[PDB]
Amino acid sequence: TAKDILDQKINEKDAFYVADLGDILKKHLRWLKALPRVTPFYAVKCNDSKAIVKTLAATGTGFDCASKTEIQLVQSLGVPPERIIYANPCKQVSQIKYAANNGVQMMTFDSEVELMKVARAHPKAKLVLRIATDDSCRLSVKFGATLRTSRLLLERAKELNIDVVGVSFHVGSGCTDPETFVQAISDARCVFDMGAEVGFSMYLLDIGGGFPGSEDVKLKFEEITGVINPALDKYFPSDSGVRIIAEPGRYYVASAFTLAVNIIAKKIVLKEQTGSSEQTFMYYVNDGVYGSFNCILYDHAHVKPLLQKRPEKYYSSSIWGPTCDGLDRIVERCDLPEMHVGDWMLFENMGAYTVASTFNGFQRPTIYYVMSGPAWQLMQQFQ
Amino acid sequence: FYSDDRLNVTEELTSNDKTRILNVQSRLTDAKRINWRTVLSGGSLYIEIPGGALPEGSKDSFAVLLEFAEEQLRADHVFICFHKNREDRAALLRTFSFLGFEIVRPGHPLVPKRPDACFMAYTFE
Numbered sequence: 001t002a003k004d005i006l007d008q009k010i011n012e013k014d015a016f017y018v019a020d021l022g023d024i025l026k027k028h029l030r031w032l033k034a035l036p037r038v039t040p041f042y043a044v045k046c047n048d049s050k051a052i053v054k055t056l057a058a059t060g061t062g063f064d065c066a067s068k069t070e071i072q073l074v075q076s077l078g079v080p081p082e083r084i085i086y087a088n089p090c091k092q093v094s095q096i097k098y099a100a101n102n103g104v105q106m107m108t109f110d111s112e113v114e115l116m117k118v119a120r121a122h123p124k125a126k127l128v129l130r131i132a133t134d135d136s137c138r139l140s141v142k143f144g145a146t147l148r149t150s151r152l153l154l155e156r157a158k159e160l161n162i163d164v165v166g167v168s169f170h171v172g173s174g175c176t177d178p179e180t181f182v183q184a185i186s187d188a189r190c191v192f193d194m195g196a197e198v199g200f201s202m203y204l205l206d207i208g209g210g211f212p213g214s215e216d217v218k219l220k221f222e223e224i225t226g227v228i229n230p231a232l233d234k235y236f237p238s239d240s241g242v243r244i245i246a247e248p249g250r251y252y253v254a255s256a257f258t259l260a261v262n263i264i265a266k267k268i269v270l271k272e273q274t275g276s277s278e279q280t281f282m283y284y285v286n287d288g289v290y291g292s293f294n295c296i297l298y299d300h301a302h303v304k305p306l307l308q309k310r311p312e313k314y315y316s317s318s319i320w321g322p323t324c325d326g327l328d329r330i331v332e333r334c335d336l337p338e339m340h341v342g343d344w345m346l347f348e349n350m351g352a353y354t355v356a357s358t359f360n361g362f363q364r365p366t367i368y369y370v371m372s373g374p375a376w377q378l379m380q381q382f383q
Numbered sequence: 384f385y386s387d388d389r390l391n392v393t394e395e396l397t398s399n400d401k402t403r404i405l406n407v408q409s410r411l412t413d414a415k416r417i418n419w420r421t422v423l424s425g426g427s428l429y430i431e432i433p434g435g436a437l438p439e440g441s442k443d444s445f446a447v448l449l450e451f452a453e454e455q456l457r458a459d460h461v462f463i464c465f466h467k468n469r470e471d472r473a474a475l476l477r478t479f480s481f482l483g484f485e486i487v488r489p490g491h492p493l494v495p496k497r498p499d500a501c502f503m504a505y506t507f508e
């Protein structure tokens with residue numbers, strides 16, 4: 001179920017993916033056991049593959065869409081508008097207009113401009129005020145409203161007769177301290193209360209995403225939820241009737257995908273100096289940082305290559321993309337056997353922010369989905 | 384200089400050139416005014432991100448800038464252009480990524496040939 005389809009596709013060019021839907025079902029069950037009070041709204045931007053969205057639709061998740069395209073896709077799979085939230089940090093009038101025309105109610109905002117645009121194109125929308133979180137991974141621009149701004153925006157909203165029904169926040173994947181959630185939740189409550197003073201009856205809490213997609217991280221998912229749950233019980237008890245949702249992205253899809261790339265070029269580099277004398281290799285593959293490896297440029301990610309052909313002396317080696325750009329370096333240094341043009345290399349945990357572009361002209365790599373018998377039975381359960 | 388557009392949140396002035404240079408000042412209420420140097424070429428707007436940290440209210444400033452690019456300019460794309468050799472390159476990339484920008488492949492026809500620069504693009508629907 002793992003490398004069998006991989007090897008089968010190796011035996012009988014272009015870099016391709018093998019994805020395990022069963023792993024995704026596992027992720028969903030795991031979410032159900034870890035956060036029983038929280039409804040997951042899958043962040044489509046993470047991986048907008050039709051099969052993923054269809055699987056999660058069948059299992060009954062919501063959908064965090066960020067554009068007309070994602071909304072159209074999700075709707076074209078039979079998903080009711082009630083399971084969709086439009087949560088783009090920066091929306092245009094036309095976008096919001098499309099949301100209004102197509103039945104989408106839940107929508108985020110963190111600014112007066114977004115608010116006035118919403119009042120302009122989508123009145124009677126159910127607004128969810130996005131609040132900022134502690135930035136200890138960092139960003140160059142502040143996202144989400146401060147508490148003061150939150151109050152002012154609430155007053156402005158009631159002033160514009162717009163309905164504010166809740167609060168959202170988004171810690172992000174760069175989190176190293178689960179405390180960041182608690183604080184945020186605390187703050188959300190403080191905003192909820194503010195709403196009560198303005199005359200709003202808020203019921204929707206959205207704790208966003210940022211939850212890890214693999215165990216190859218420092219802060220595990222269960223370690224985060226184990227801190228989230230008591231925070232929720234304290235600041236948002238069940239008796240209040242609060243509806244709690246989240247916007248997980250990488251958590252659902254990261255570990256389900258394995259990428260196979262092919263070595264398209266090869267160079268030998270010998271460093272000589274009298275007084276190291278070191279022989280190293282560098283390989284060029286048919287994918288890179290402008291393709292599936294944006295994470296190299298985004299998060300300075302350290303990906304680890306895996307031999308599809310496990311064996312041999314090991315040499316210091318580097319792996320590069322096909323663009324020959326100074327930034328298209330996938331692996332700076334790793335120990336590998338001497339490989340050849342035409343050999344394959346595998347990279348695991350490649351489901352999040354990898355696939356899909358259309359702008360660059362780079363056609364989406366082929367994906368092979370695999371589901372075991374029992375996994376397909378469990379799939380048939382939800383549907 | 385030529386007065387291009389004036390809104391309640393923006394003031395744009397044009398500088399003389401072949402392709403139209405637009406100095407775009409955002410004026411958000413209770414927020415410091417922000418000047419962006421942009422260029423309009425081939426139905427696309429290219430915005431120069433200046434060295435150093437981005438000013439307060441850069442998010443809303445960019446929101447109104449984008450809205451101006453779609454509504455008034457009727458642009459097909461908006462480009463973020465910045466010096467590749469920055470210590471905060473990844474932070475910028477992440478930021479505009481959140482805003483909806485995607486990394487442009489070096490050598491793309493819609494991007495000028497400058498290997499010392501990073502480009503992200505935003506496409507309207």
Ligand SMILES: *Cc1c(COP(=O)(O)O)cnc(C)c1O
Pocket residue numbers: 043046064087088089170172173208209210211247248249250251352481
């Ligand atoms: C980017 C983003 C996410 C991403 O979630 P991940 O689990 O980190 O992939 C979720 N929600 C919103 C609103 C986002 O903008």
Ligand SMILES: [Mg+2]
Pocket residue numbers: 209210211212213247248249250251252
């Ligand atoms: Mg996640």
